[PDB]
């Protein structure tokens, strides 16, 4: 159900400044994930996006959704297994139906809601939304392949 | 509420030393409630510590001092970016600080400061930092606002 | 309106700055039609510290972002030409992204070339599609709809 | 136990890393009693981008941090001597901070000297107090309690 | 010993890391004789934040550094071949630099090509000289002497 | 003036983080010599890569700090402490020669730049000297620069 940063670090190979999931609040195998990233001014991204107007990049929202969806796919098949995690990689083949509705800014808790749309073998198609305070800020569908590292 | 854009117009602190994201409550000469989001995507966590992200205790205090500073700026001159842009903030004293619970990525670090005493530019504040309604830290501090 | 633009000119048009300005040079520009630009990929970028240790792969979403910035440069200059003063008052936003395909990984040493074509434009609304290429090969494809909005 | 330690020795004892390793050299050390150490202050530090633009002032809270790290080096080597294999699985938590006064701003070009004395220690819990100094003058006073803990 | 090496190979031979690994790819290598390598130059490098605001220019001294690293890669693979096991036990020290000329500024979007030849070598001491080139034009010249030393 | 602090250096040199490599000027004699320094601390980004577990201040950046000191000397010799004119000038370094590194520089070192004017003819300034740590010569270099409009 709940995974904290330490758990996340053992599953995902992403490190600073490209690990964009802070906590997993909900996880149903083969079904859905709810996770989040806290948004703060204290992030290097905001130096350039943009000067005097801090806006969390929309592509990094999608990236966070992908990272959530990849975590869903991996743990669905192998559970919380750091040893297997090092032998596998989840890369993203496609991204589709992306819509941005509301700008994300420092102070926002950026929540990722992804469900498994379909899966066959190592090909997993996830989809859902990014949410701040109950509102949809973005949506996206993503297709991942799981492979050997 | 004051948002990051408003905070930037008052506090002189910038990246990577601006440690308040939003002001939720402000009562002139009385108290302030504010917060900073804690995320893994912060440079500090590279060194504090490897494989063990713990938000530095001294930076909790700094975030409290900045919250106190916002309260000080605005109690003094109201929301005035023009006056603000000439000033900086010096730490004078820190006392009676206790850390109870570690602060980690995914935490909403909420600052609760009240005015203990003030005179001119010298402001003494005290209160707590909280995560999910729990006190993670206590501190008292005195800061001075000065011309740049 | 020129067809070649260097970083000096890109900085005057785009509001993006480090570490989110992801276009280094523009090699072809045809108003309301197309842009060919590129970003150099080097190990000396902070992004590779995290993506990934011992295995530097340029993030696919940053390829898309770089395509969007190229598209945004094209959109603005198609309407106002090289006008830094007005550029300073405008900002281009992503509305949608569709049909994104990652074909080949991008790595240090690569010259990431953005090829964007104008699919539709009406006023401030611009639909662009195209590819990111390395040494003549398609590494990514994307379509996006952008909005030229007020900065304030 | 030696009395002088260099950055290599510090790295082998303290768990802190960039951008939070704030002790550069140890000049004297008496086990269970005192430590004198220092950190060089240069404009070439990332903190100075934010504290403050056009007026670089080394943050007071980081002076306290460096004093704590000095006490933590003293604490560890007093416990286990110079043992990097024991050290690499330890971390250090701040417990309390009291009676800190900042007297003089610290700026680029300063050699920030930490002088800590052990006020009380019991097991992993070390209470140190002292001063930070620049050119023989007290820029800061501080009392603090830190706990050494096994990473778990 | 092959002729082309990519970033993952360079990582395994050179001890340099971010932000001081300034070679992205090796295109040509003749043991004990010469090397052609390059670094891509992008705006997305932290160094351009300070060199200079509103005018990105790749520092001349860092061009020399990239040439030394190219020389160092040549030096090591000449003596040990592609041996990551032994590469881990070594660093490189600059001993001398001579005859350096800066002819053309290097900017974002440039492919910085390093051409170095061995002038003299004995044991760990390697003397190299050559040019840095962008689009076939000489941007810089330098001679340098380096030593491969045991990490101890 | 004879002594300049970081505030003054920022107003004369266009260099900024992470390429401003002079922290303070302790001596300045117009047309003759400059003594300046940069503090070396582990808390610098360069040390992440140069090298892991063995922090060594890059030799090329010693030379760079010497060049910066030479440029400050040249500029202040021509116009003194003038931030307004500073914004309109560049000091372009054309050549570097006779550089030798004797002792590695590490966190905790006070890197002192000793530079003197070797030749000044029109826009061309030729400067040379040493970098020192605790009175010992750690590096030496000669440099030639040209004054020009920004
Ligand atoms: C351990 O090696 C890795 C790790 C990754 O995160 C990734 C990878 C390889 O490569 C993935 C990829 C990207 C593009 C492509 O055409 C084929 C695969 C993208 C990715 O996220
Ligand atoms: C006080 O005036 C100075 C001093 C310098 O050292 C320098 C300078 C101006 O400006 C030079 C410069 C060179 C090229 C450019 O596009 C912008 C600035 C770099 C330099 O080292
Ligand atoms: Cl965006
Ligand atoms: Cl702490
Ligand atoms: Cl990717
Ligand atoms: Cl302070
Ligand atoms: Cl240069
Ligand atoms: Cl060196």
Description:
6 copies of one chain form a homohexamer. Chain A has a 6-stranded antiparallel beta sheet with strand order 1-2-4-5-6-3, covered by helices on one side. Chain A has helices spanning 5-11, 58-78, 82-85, and strands spanning 23-28, 32-38, 88-100, 109-120, 123-132, 135-148. The relative contact order of chain A is 0.21. The first copy, chain A, has 3 helices and 6 strands. In chain A, β1 (23-28) and β2 (32-38) form a beta hairpin. Chain A is of the alpha+beta class and 149 residues long. The A-C interface holds A 13-19, 44-45, 47-51, 53, 57-60, 62-63, 66, 91-100, 140 and C 15-21, 46-47, 49-53, 55, 59-62, 64-65, 68, 91, 93-102, 151. The structure holds the ligand COc1cc(O)c2c(c1)O[C@H](c1ccc(O)cc1)CC2=O (2 copies) and chloride ion (6 copies).
Per DSSP, what share of the residues of chain A sits in E-state strands of 2 or more residues?
Answer: 35-45%
Quaternary assembly = homohexamer
Q: What is the percent of helical residues of chain A?
A: 10-25%
Largest sheet of chain A: 6 strands, antiparallel
InterPro entries (chain F): FabA_FabZ (IPR013114), FabZ (IPR010084), HotDog_dom_sf (IPR029069)
Function (chain F): Involved in unsaturated fatty acids biosynthesis. Catalyzes the dehydration of short chain beta-hydroxyacyl-ACPs and long chain saturated and unsaturated beta-hydroxyacyl-ACPs.
Pfam families (chain F): FabA (PF07977)
Family (chain F): Belongs to the thioester dehydratase family. FabZ subfamily.
